[PDB]
């Protein structure tokens, strides 16, 4: 019924809604009403979303899909049309308005003319049919717009040279971005769209005032709405050029302000020299004139009064008329104080506060003059003060006012500053003014330095605003190179504006030195401008900047504020420090700041409050614990003071309102007198200071508050209306809610505290341990505020450390000087533009990642009072009032005080999110969300009821979790890693029951059987989720503790641990040993790569991995190298047919690019209406990314791993950011599996706790002697079946192999040498080596078998040894082991002193004699001389041994060599000789001085093509000297392990490769077609054909360094220690 | 109660500035005074003969550099350091009676590096010693 | 021609300046050359195979950085600049740097003011050798402060003594000199009360 109504409303709306077209300069009819069209599509899509949810959707399923497809095409097409229309409009005006562009850019005009004619043609077509349906169905209109946008994009970039030409005409254009400048130039005819670009060009002018015709500029306006009326308005008709009439506006702005100031000065002289002042007259004068003129007029009047008084006191006995000046100031101050106490308009209230702040300073100075007995106007006690002199007789209005301080003379620039937050004139600020003005007089710069929050940036700006100068703030960083700073200096010099380069020392040291040349020549030009010999008739003064003559305006100045010893900063060169006059701003006068600020806000007890709040802040700093997120400086005090003014204002309004309901009485005096000013200050302190406090610091601060403010109590206002919104939102998100002391009570207070911080600060931090309820706090509040206030909330979650700083903020091209927007810049610029109504929504930018000064200090100006984002290209982006920059971090260890002081911290302790809160969330999701996508839900609900008693506080799970923290694990234990693994494993129990029900349709599972299964599985689940990453005895230890505390039935075995038992689907404990049979491996699969002998450890881990993998949950296998992590994972993946694994080998140089290259090769990006989706190319199969060295990638100096942060983002948020176009890509059907050695191993860094939370860890230990005997006893029995006579010796052979391996592992450890790693991999290679030797032998005496056994032991355990005594020990112990396990054998026939095997002298692999081998090698060397290399060689015993070792490796698949020895030992010559003997083709990279990474890639491709496509065996010989970059090793690391490089072949190279793999497959006889199996065949061929020989010197630190940079060099290459000639 | 009558070495404390606040906070709470109104006065005691009087807090280990304290009067000395036997920190209400023209404010640094300042004491000059001479000679007090 | 080393195009200017100077015979100064030790190797090689003009002089300014190439130090002549050993040496360099005409101006009392400035500079700069006692930290009391203080004396003395050959010592602006030095010239670097 209503379903049909929805379909009808959609149909009648869309067949009647016509696009809105209006005439545009009698050229075409553009489309308006964008908001109406967009929201209508969105609201109709939402109706289509609700179409599907209803049960009656079945019959209406077909019609809804047709409508949604229509809506998406309408949404997608008009989303592009709005873009192309805007680009066309301003591009057309540029090409049409200016006729000079016809010649400079002829080809570019021709391209746009064709585009415009095509665009105008489409305007005619859409004008004929204004209906939305008709225009949508235009043939190829969607494609026609994508090319239109691309064509408009290409023409847009080419106008960069034209823009730089136009910036010279109006110098203020230098601080406008390229795109915004295009809009200003193009839209010169339509001035109405320029009103959003004036704020980037003027200090306080936000918009201009125009008449009805919009052809005459009547005046200017500020952001607050303050307006200045031009005396002679500027008419645009007579000056059509955009730069021509903009210049006249600026010139008229200064003259009008000067004329208005002269009138204001004339009026204010009446108030001066007056004993009594009328409040009505004074208020009228304040309202009449601008905020900057009212304060300036007061300053002029006071300066003239003191000058007159001091001149009158020339005799010294003139009865001190200075008392009259002090009396007048106090009388006027009394009137201002009275006016503030009553309600005033917001603009007049700001004017009164500015007047109070200045008149307090004027009163203080006059008292100092009175106290010091100053009777001369030339006394330095008066000369050091800032004095304003007005000359009404001056013909030029711009020169009427003169500002003087000490011996420095200044002129007011009359720049319209609007209404700015004026600073309190503290004695430190007076010292700052004196030093900075002295620097200006000497034509030097000012360099105030000190700790963060002392007020250096504001003081420099305040002085500039005091002189009426245009002050520009730049947030300097390391990308402010010579060209960027030179262009900024060019703009400042021409404009005549002050440049405050905050954080100047954040530049590179080399770049600071380079900039010193530009500052030096600029100051030299300024210095010679002040010479009295200079004449304005001559050429204007110029300086050589960027190889160009630049005129230097006298009003320009350079100021640099820096923190000397903060992290992330550089040291200024000495030649640069002499160009600046430094001042130490270390201790702000916060006592006077508090007093004046509270006095101007209307507080009656400001002096008492200031004397109580400033010491309170000092005591808090000196008493509270030293926390990384604590800041009790001036910014914290300033935030409290401004909150106190806001709290008082709203409290007064509430009191005034309350009297309305009660009756009729409004008395400002009674309200002001009866106001709890003590409670107001405490409320602001508690609303700002409590959230950041740790649990143990809260009582200390409240005790301090009680002592400082005795008898005053604070009761927080109950935000009731928000609490129901939180309660409703929490219920929908399965989140526990609590009030006060209830469960979840602490979490809700944190949410409310975070809400208050959002209202006060525009920059937030959520500091707290991993899994402390931070993300849920702001997610719930954002949704709750959306419901409560009706404003849509949009969050842009960004990981700053998952991408490089260039991709986060943007980069400037060194050659073309074109700015490319980064991730954060694009997000912020998109909101500022508000093309799609982004400014009407609550926008939150959440930085979910680590904070370090490298990237976070670029937001110093954003989080400051500037609320500005400054880029190296001179562009500034004002932070909109609706945007909050929010940080979600776990610590602030590496963040400097510059950023901690800029944000309001909210501390989320781990006790905020109690354990039972997580338990309730798990059970709520279990009872509501089906696991399949209901019989499955019914199983979940029944299982949840059984698990309810255990998932309670002080229950089984909580007690077990507490005990598991005492035990140590292979990785640091976190609560949510255990719970996250436990919850994912209990879901598999529900799936197991559902599978059982499907398997038994007639008899489904009953409740009693369900209770038995779930109760037993939960105990099984707790054991493997809590002790899964711990050694065997603590898997046991957690077992008895559970046995001691649980009531669930447990196995009755006296000694078998519970970890050895599984839970059958029938509901009974069954041993894991029942699934471990004594299998018999086939002879031809002995020690095969994929053959796994099932043992107790293998079956337990395979089931555990399958449980986690079936949930598509990330996991990490941790354990010693060679323990069996990869083997266990691949064995478990064989049970999942819909999962394909892709191997990734991490190294110390691993970056997210390695993952991105894999995504490009194995996945594809597809556009969907919900966004971009990254899914594997093959349909229906889940991609598993196996990262083999996940903890190897290097931590930077701030303790983070970029690849790990990339994965952590891409696991938690299910996607990442594509830096190509700054779009969010969402993963689909992609899984991650990691493997790593324990973090205590050398070169391994512990993983972040914010990453380990999402990832369960399983510990795979080395097999024990019993396990090794079973594993390799099976291999030996199957291998020895080749010779039936030797089958009796299978058991002693396995015992000897295990015994020798055990002793060799113990004797040689990583402490001695880095490569002394002995694992079961050597045993597997031991079995293979014996198998290959016996395979051919038809018969062999027991002595022959032992000789082969010893030879394999020598080649596996002795070749890597370094010292001679270690080799001697190995030789001796092999003899003892063979005799111990094989008695009564011919020792001489078996344990002969030289043991050599070679297939060179026969068809088989039989032992060879040294003398006969030497003759054969001598004969073959003679032939080798003439054919390949005529270098004579000398054959001694070691050479014969070494050539045999190299020959053995060259005959193996994927046989790589690592030859370590001193240079000149023959490592390369022997490698070439053996390769020639074995038929391999030797390849060496011809490295030279200009060799780079691209050359190595070409060489790598050449070898792979020869060895993969042409089936040519290649001995790729590489030396350590050939490695000129870390990139060479990273490519080699992947090639050695996987046999392939994912990103090596791209574009034409990939296409050329695929043809060559296809033709090569034809020769082999396989007609492979698809690219997937062509690459798989190519990878298989490279594996079997490419041998890499790596030669390096026996360095000590170099070998350890290579063990981390290229881990595959020690795991895939057979290491031989050639050393030096003995 | 004994925690008030124990002599503590400021050098041996992890944070000595928190102890000064704690003694300040104790006196204000006991006498029902406000925290900001309190001022600190120093009284170096020969040995430990003097007794604490509900506002004094004995401090040991203070080292005087370049001066000698006799009867709570300073005199310039050629010795590198002079050990103060027992320093009594008495918290008293502010009386704003101005300086005595023979009282110099000595910084009290934590260690010899003179990098961090704990608090400041107002000692008294003996005889005819110039207060400017104390400033020039870098006379200060070291916690350890 | 003075070039500050550290920029990519700074090396281009340095090479062009040296190529032109070796023919014309002018002087070339390259500052902060310790920031490009790799380019210093090439500069040493270029200088060795060169036959410059008789009057050509190349000045390299560094920081006594252990990354400066050894072969550059051997080829060139090293001049080390550091605080003078004592007060007497501090006075001598202070008086030598100031031109004789600057001290000998219209007021005969300018010479005594410069001497007092020379003595005050010598005392405070020598106190830096005793880091905990002389000051609280290693302040950068250098030649830039002395230049600013000398400019302050010249400006204020000219303002009071407007061409007078002699000025009474009482009329000398002691308050201006004392306050400006304590707040701006020398007291700017001071951060301790
Ligand atoms: N109020 C709540 N009630 C119930 N469960 C909650 C509540 N808040 C959080 N949780 C759950 O507890 C866990 C905490 O996750 P959350 O995202 O809030 O942590 P976090 O502090 O942001 O962690 P991280 O530092 O890893 O980003 C999640 O499993 C979440 O579902
Ligand atoms: N139960 C088992 N059955 C057969 N081989 C085993 C067993 N346990 C260990 N191995 C041997 O141990 C080696 C494990 O190496 P691998 O798993 O590749 O190390 P890593 O997991 O560190 O990459 C394999 O070569 C395998 O032959
Ligand atoms: N066994 C040997 N007898 C004689 N000369 C040798 C022998 N081994 C190496 N050389 C000499 O070493 C030189 C080649 O050294 P090379 O093998 O490239 O050093 P590296 O092994 O460090 O790469 C040849 O010129 C050869 O004369
Ligand atoms: Mg700043
Ligand atoms: Mg989070």
From Swiss-Prot, chain B:
Similarity section = Belongs to the dynein heavy chain family.
Location in or out of the cell: Cytoplasm, Cytoskeleton
Q: What is this protein called?
A: Cytoplasmic dynein 1 heavy chain 1
Q: Which residues of the full protein are shown?
A: 4502 to 4645 of 4646
**Assembly:** Homodimer. The cytoplasmic dynein 1 complex consists of two catalytic heavy chains (HCs) and a number of non-catalytic subunits presented by intermediate chains (ICs), light intermediate chains (LICs) and light chains (LCs); the composition seems to vary in respect to the IC, LIC and LC composition. The heavy chain homodimer serves as a scaffold for the probable homodimeric assembly of the respective non-catalytic subunits. The ICs and LICs bind directly to the HC dimer and dynein LCs assemble on the IC dimer. Interacts with DYNC1LI1; DYNC1LI1 and DYNC1LI2 bind mutually exclusive to DYNC1H1.
Report the function annotation for this chain.
Cytoplasmic dynein 1 acts as a motor for the intracellular retrograde motility of vesicles and organelles along microtubules. Dynein has ATPase activity; the force-producing power stroke is thought to occur on release of ADP. Plays a role in mitotic spindle assembly and metaphase plate congression.
Give the domain note: Dynein heavy chains probably consist of an N-terminal stem (which binds cargo and interacts with other dynein components), and the head or motor domain. The motor contains six tandemly-linked AAA domains in the head, which form a ring. A stalk-like structure (formed by two of the coiled coil domains) protrudes between AAA 4 and AAA 5 and terminates in a microtubule-binding site. A seventh domain may also contribute to this ring; it is not clear whether the N-terminus or the C-terminus forms this extra domain.
Recorded disease is: Charcot-Marie-Tooth disease, axonal, type 2O: An axonal form of Charcot-Marie-Tooth disease, a disorder of the peripheral nervous system, characterized by progressive weakness and atrophy, initially of the peroneal muscles and later of the distal muscles of the arms. Charcot-Marie-Tooth disease is classified in two main groups on the basis of electrophysiologic properties and histopathology: primary peripheral demyelinating neuropathies (designated CMT1 when they are dominantly inherited) and primary peripheral axonal neuropathies (CMT2).
UniProtKB/Swiss-Prot annotation, chain C:
Identify the domain of life.
Eukaryota
Q: Where are the Phosphoserine modifications? A: 96
Q: Which compartments does it reside in?
A: Cytoplasm, Cytoskeleton
**What are the start and end residues of every segment in region (AAA 6)?**
1-155
User: Which family does the record claim for this protein?
Assistant: Belongs to the dynein heavy chain family.
Give the disease entry from the UniProt record: Charcot-Marie-Tooth disease, axonal, type 2O: An axonal form of Charcot-Marie-Tooth disease, a disorder of the peripheral nervous system, characterized by progressive weakness and atrophy, initially of the peroneal muscles and later of the distal muscles of the arms. Charcot-Marie-Tooth disease is classified in two main groups on the basis of electrophysiologic properties and histopathology: primary peripheral demyelinating neuropathies (designated CMT1 when they are dominantly inherited) and primary peripheral axonal neuropathies (CMT2). Cortical dysplasia, complex, with other brain malformations 13: An autosomal dominant disorder characterized by global developmental delay with impaired intellectual development. Some patients show signs of peripheral neuropathy, such as abnormal gait and hyporeflexia. CDCBM13 is associated with variable neuronal migration defects resulting in cortical malformations.
**Complex and partners:** Homodimer. The cytoplasmic dynein 1 complex consists of two catalytic heavy chains (HCs) and a number of non-catalytic subunits presented by intermediate chains (ICs), light intermediate chains (LICs) and light chains (LCs); the composition seems to vary in respect to the IC, LIC and LC composition. The heavy chain homodimer serves as a scaffold for the probable homodimeric assembly of the respective non-catalytic subunits. The ICs and LICs bind directly to the HC dimer and dynein LCs assemble on the IC dimer. Interacts with DYNC1LI1; DYNC1LI1 and DYNC1LI2 bind mutually exclusive to DYNC1H1.
Q: What does this protein do?
A: Cytoplasmic dynein 1 acts as a motor for the intracellular retrograde motility of vesicles and organelles along microtubules. Dynein has ATPase activity; the force-producing power stroke is thought to occur on release of ADP. Plays a role in mitotic spindle assembly and metaphase plate congression.
Free-text note on domains in this protein's UniProt record: Dynein heavy chains probably consist of an N-terminal stem (which binds cargo and interacts with other dynein components), and the head or motor domain. The motor contains six tandemly-linked AAA domains in the head, which form a ring. A stalk-like structure (formed by two of the coiled coil domains) protrudes between AAA 4 and AAA 5 and terminates in a microtubule-binding site. A seventh domain may also contribute to this ring; it is not clear whether the N-terminus or the C-terminus forms this extra domain.
Q: What name does UniProt use for this protein?
A: Cytoplasmic dynein 1 heavy chain 1
Q: Which organism is it from?
A: Homo sapiens
Q: Which gene encodes it?
A: DYNC1H1
Which stretch of the intact protein is present? 4067 to 4259 of 4646
């Amino acid at each position: 019924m209503a379903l049909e109504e929805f379909l009808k409303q959609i149909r009648e709306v869309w067949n009647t809604y016509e696009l809105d077209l209006v005439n545009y300069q009698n050229k075409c009819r553009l489309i308006r009403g964008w908001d109406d069209l967009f929201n209508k599509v969105k609201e109709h899509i939402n109706s289509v979303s609700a179409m599907k949810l209803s049960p009656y959707y079945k019959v209406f399923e077909e019609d809804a899909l047709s409508w949604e497809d229509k809506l998406n095409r309408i949404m997608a097409l008009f989303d592009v049309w709005i873009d192309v229309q805007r680009r066309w409009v301003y591009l057309e005006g540029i090409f049409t308005g200016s006729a000079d562009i016809k010649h400079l850019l002829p080809v570019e005009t021709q391209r746009f003319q064709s585009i415009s004619t095509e665009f105008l043609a489409l305007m005619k077509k859409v004008s004929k049919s204004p209906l939305v349906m008709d225009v949508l169905n235009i043939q190829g209109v969607q494609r026609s717009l994508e090319r239109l946008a691309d064509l408009l994009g290409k023409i847009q970039k080419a106008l960069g040279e034209y823009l730089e030409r136009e910036r010279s005409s109006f110098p203020r254009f230098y601080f406008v971005g390229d795109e915004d400048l295009l809009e200003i130039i193009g839209n010169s005819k339509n001035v109405a769209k320029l009103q959003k670009h004036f704020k980037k060009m003027f200090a306080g002018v936000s918009s201009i005032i125009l008449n009805e015709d919009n052809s005459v500029v009547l005046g200017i306006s500020s952001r607050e709405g303050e307006e200045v009326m031009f005396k002679t308005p500027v008419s645009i008709t007579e000056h059509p050029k955009i730069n021509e009439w903009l210049t006249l506006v600026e010139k008229e702005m200064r003259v009008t302000l000067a004329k208005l100031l002269a009138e204001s000065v004339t009026e204010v002289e009446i108030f001066g020299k007056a004993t009594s002042i009328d409040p009505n007259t004074y208020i009228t004068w304040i309202d009449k004139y601008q905020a900057q003129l009212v304060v300036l007029s007061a300053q002029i009047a006071w300066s003239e009064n003191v000058e007159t008084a001091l001149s009158s006191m020339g005799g010294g006995g003139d009865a001190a008329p200075l008392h009259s000046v002090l009396s007048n100031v106090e009388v006027t101050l009394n009137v201002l104080a009275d006016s503030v106490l009553m309600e005033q308009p917001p603009l007049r209230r700001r004017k009164l506060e500015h007047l109070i702040t200045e008149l307090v300073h004027q009163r203080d100075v006059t008292r100092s003059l009175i106290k010091s007995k100053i009777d001369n106007a030339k006394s330095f006690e008066w000369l050091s003060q800032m004095r304003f002199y007005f000359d009404p007789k001056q013909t030029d209005v711009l020169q009427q006012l003169s500002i003087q301080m000490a011996n420095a003379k200044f002129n007011y620039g009359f720049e319209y500053l609007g209404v700015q937050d004026k600073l309190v004139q503290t004695p430190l600020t007076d010292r700052c003014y004196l030093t900075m003005t002295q620097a200006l007089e000497a034509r030097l710069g000012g360099s105030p330095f000190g700790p963060a929050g002392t007020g250096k940036t504001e003081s420099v700006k305040a002085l500039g605003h005091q002189l009426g100068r245009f002050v520009l703030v730049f947030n300097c960083d390391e990308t402010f190179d010579f060209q960027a700073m030179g262009r900024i200096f060019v703009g400042l010099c021409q404009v005549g504006a002050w440049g405050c380069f905050d954080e100047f020392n954040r530049l590179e040291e080399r770049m600071l030195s380079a900039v010193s040349q530009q500052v030096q020549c600029i100051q030299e030009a300024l210095r010679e401008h002040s010479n009295p010999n200079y004449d304005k008739t001559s050429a204007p003064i110029t300086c050589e900047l960027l190889n160009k003559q630049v005129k230097v305006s006298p009003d320009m100045a350079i100021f640099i504020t820096m923190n000397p010893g903060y992290a992330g900063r550089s040291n200024l060169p000495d030649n640069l420090k002499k160009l600046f006059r430094s001042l130490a701003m270390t201790k702000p006068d916060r006592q006077l700041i508090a007093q004046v600020m509270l006095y101007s806000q209307g507080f009656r007890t400001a002096e008492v409050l200031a004397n109580k709040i400033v010491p309170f802040f000092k005591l808090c700093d000196e008493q509270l614990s030293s926390q990384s997120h604590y800041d009790f400086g001036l910014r914290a005090l300033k935030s409290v003071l401004v909150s106190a003014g806001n709290v008082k204002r709203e409290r007064i309004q509430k009191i005034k309102r309350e009297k309305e309901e009660r009756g009729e009485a409004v008395d400002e005096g009674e309200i002001a007198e009866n106001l709890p000013e003590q409670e107001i200050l405490i409320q602001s302190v508690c609303e700002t200071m409590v959230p950041k406090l740790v649990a143990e610091d809260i009582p200390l601060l409240f005790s301090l508050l009680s002592d400082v403010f005795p008898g005053v109590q604070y009761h927080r206002g109950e935000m009731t209306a928000l609490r129901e919104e939180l309660k409703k939102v929490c219920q929908e998100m399965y989140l526990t809610y609590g009030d006060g002391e209830e469960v979840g009570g602490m979490w809700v207070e944190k949410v409310l505290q975070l809400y208050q911080i959002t209202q006060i600060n525009h920059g937030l931090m959520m500091v707290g341990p991993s899994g402390s309820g931070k993300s849920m706090a702001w997610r719930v509040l954002l949704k709750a505020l959306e419901r409560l206030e009706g404003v849509e909330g949009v969050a842009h979650i960004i990981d700053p450390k998952a991408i490089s700083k260039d991709h986060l903020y943007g980069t400037l091209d060194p050659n073309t000087r074109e700015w490319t927007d980064g991730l954060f810049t694009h997000v912020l610029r998109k909101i500022i533009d508000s093309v799609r109504g982004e400014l009407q929504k609550r926008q939150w930018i959440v930085f979910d990642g680590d904070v370090d000064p490298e990237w976070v200090e670029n937001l110093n100006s954003v989080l400051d009072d500037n609320k500005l984002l400054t880029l190296p290209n001179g562009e500034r982006l004002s932070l909109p009032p609706n945007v909050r920059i929010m940080f979600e971090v776990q610590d602030l260890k590496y963040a400097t005080l510059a950023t901690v002081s800029r944000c309001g911290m909210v501390w989320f302790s781990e006790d905020v999110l109690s354990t039972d809160m997580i338990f309730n969330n798990f059970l709520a999701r279990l009872r509501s969300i089906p696991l399949d996508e209901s019989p499955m839900l019914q199983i979940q609900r029944d299982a949840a009821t059984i698990m309810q008693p255990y998932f309670t506080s002080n229950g089984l799970v909580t007690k077990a979790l507490e005990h598991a923290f005492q035990l140590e694990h292979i990785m640091d234990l976190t609560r949510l890693r255990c719970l996250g693994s436990l919850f994912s494993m209990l879901h598999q129990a529900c799936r197991n029951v559902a599978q059982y029900n499907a398997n038994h349709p007639d008899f489904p599972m009953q409740i009693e059987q369900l209770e038995r299964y779930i109760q037993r599985y939960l105990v099984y689940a707790i054991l493997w989720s809590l002790s899964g990453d711990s050694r065997l005895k603590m898997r046991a230890e957690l077992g008895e503790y559970i046995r001691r505390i649980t009531t669930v039935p447990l196995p009755t075995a006296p000694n078998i641990p519970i970890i050895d038992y599984e839970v059958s689907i029938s509901g009974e404990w069954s041993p894991w040993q029942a699934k471990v049979p004594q299998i018999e491996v086939e002879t031809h699969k002995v020690a095969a790569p994929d053959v796994v002998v099932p043992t107790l450890d293998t079956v337990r881990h395979e089931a555990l991995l399958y449980t986690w993998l079936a949930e598509h949950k990330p996991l990490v296998l941790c354990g010693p190298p060679g323990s069996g992590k990869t083997m266990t994972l691949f064995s478990a993946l064989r049970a999942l047919p819909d999962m394909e694994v892709v191997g990734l080998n991490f190294s110390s140089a691993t970056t997210p690019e390695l993952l991105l290259k894999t995504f490009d090769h194995y996945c594809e990006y597809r556009r969907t209406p919900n966004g971009v989706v990254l899914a594997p190319v093959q349909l229906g199969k889940w991609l598993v990314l196996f990262c083999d060295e996940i903890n190897l990638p290097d931590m930077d100096k701030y303790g983070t791993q970029r690849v790990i942060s990339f994965i952590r983002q891409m696991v938690e948020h299910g996607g990442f950011y594509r830096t190509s176009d700054q779009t969010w890509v969402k993963l689909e059907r992609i899984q991650f599996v990691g493997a790593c050695n324990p973090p205590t191993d050398p070169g391994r860094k512990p993983l972040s706790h914010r990453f380990l939370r999402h990832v369960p860890v399983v510990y795979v230990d080395y097999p024990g002697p019993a396990s090794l005997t079973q594993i390799y006893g099976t291999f030996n029995r199957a291998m020895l079946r080749l010779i039936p006579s030797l089958r009796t010796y299978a058991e002693p052979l396995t015992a000897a192999m295990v015994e020798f391996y055990t002793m060799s592992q113990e004797r040689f450890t990583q402490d001695t040498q880095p490569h002394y790693i002995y694992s079961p991999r050597e045993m597997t290679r031991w079995v293979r080596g014996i198998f290959e030797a016996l395979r051919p032998l038809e018969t062999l005496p027991v002595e022959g078998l032992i000789r082969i056994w010893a030879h394999e032991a020598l080649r596996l355990f002795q070749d890597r040894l370094v010292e001679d005594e270690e080799r001697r020990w190995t030789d001796e112990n092999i003899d003892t082991v063979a005799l111990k396990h094989f008695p009564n054998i011919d020792r001489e026939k078996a344990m002969s002193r030289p043991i050599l095997y070679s297939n060179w002298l026969s068809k088989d692999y039989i032992p060879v004699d040294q003398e006969e081998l030497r003759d054969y090698v001598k004969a073959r060397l003679k032939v080798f001389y003439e054919e390949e290399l005529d270098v004579p060689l000398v054959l001694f015993n070691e050479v014969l041994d070494h050539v045999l070792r190299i020959d053995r490796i060259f005959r193996q698949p994927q046989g790589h060599l690592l030859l370590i020895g001193v240079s000149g030992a023959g490592k390369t010559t022997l490698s070439r000789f053996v390769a020639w003997m074995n038929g391999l083709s030797v390849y060496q990279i011809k490295v030279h001085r200009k060799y780079t990474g691209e050359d190595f890639d070409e060489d790598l491709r050449t070898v792979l093509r020869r060895s993969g496509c042409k089936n040519e065996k290649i001995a790729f010989i590489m030396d350590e000297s050939n490695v000129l970059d870390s990139g060479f090793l990273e490519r080699m690391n992947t090639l050695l392990a996987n046999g392939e490089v994912p990103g090596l072949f791209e574009g034409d190279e990939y296409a050329t490769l695929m043809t060559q793999c296809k033709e090569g497959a034809q020769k082999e006889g396989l007609m492979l077609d698809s690219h997937e199996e062509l690459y798989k065949w190519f990878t298989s061929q490279v594996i079997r054909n490419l041998h890499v020989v790596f030669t390096m010197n026996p360095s000590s630190e170099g070998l350890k360094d290579r063990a981390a940079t290229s881990p595959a060099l020690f795991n895939r290459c057979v290491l031989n220690w050639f050393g030096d000639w003995s | 109660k004994e925690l008030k009558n124990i002599h503590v070495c400021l050098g041996g404390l992890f944070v000595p500035e928190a102890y000064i606040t704690a003694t300040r906070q104790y006196v204000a709470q006991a006498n029902s005074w406000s925290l900001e109104e309190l001022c600190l006065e120093v009284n170096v005691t020969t040995s430990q003969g003097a007794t604490l009087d509900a506002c004094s807090f004995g401090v040991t280990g203070l080292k005087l550099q370049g001066a000698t304290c006799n009867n709570n009067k300073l005199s310039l000395s050629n010795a590198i350091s002079t050990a103060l036997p027992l320093t009594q920190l008495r918290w008293v209400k502010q009386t704003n009676t101005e300086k005595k023209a023979s009282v110099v404010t000595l910084p009290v640094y934590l260690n010899f590096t003179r990098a961090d300042l704990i608090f400041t004491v107002d000692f008294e000059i003996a005889t005819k010693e110039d207060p400017r001479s104390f400033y020039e000679r870098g006379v200060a007090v070291l916690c350890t | 021609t003075s070039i500050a080393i550290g920029s990519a195009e700074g090396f281009n200017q340095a090479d062009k300046a040296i190529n032109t100077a070796v023919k014309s015979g002018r002087w070339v100064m390259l500052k902060n050359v310790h920031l490009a030790p790799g380019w210093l190797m090439q500069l040493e090689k270029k200088l060795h195979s060169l036959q410059p003009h008789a009057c050509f002089r190349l000045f390299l300014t560094m920081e006594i950085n252990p990354k400066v190439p050894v072969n550059l130090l051997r080829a060139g002549r090293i001049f080390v600049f550091e605080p003078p050993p004592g007060v007497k040496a501090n006075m001598l360099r202070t008086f030598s740097s100031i031109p004789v005409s600057r001290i000998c101006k219209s007021p005969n009392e300018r010479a005594r003011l410069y001497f007092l400035l020379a003595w005050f500079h010598a005392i405070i700069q020598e106190r830096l050798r005793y880091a905990p006692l002389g000051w609280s930290k290693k302040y950068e009391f250098g030649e830039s402060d002395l230049r600013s203080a000398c400019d302050t004396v010249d400006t204020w003395l000219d303002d009071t003594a407007k061409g007078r050959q002699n000025i009474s010592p009482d009329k000398i602006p002691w308050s201006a000199l004392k306050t400006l030095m304590a707040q701006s010239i020398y007291g700017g670097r001071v951060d301790n009360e």
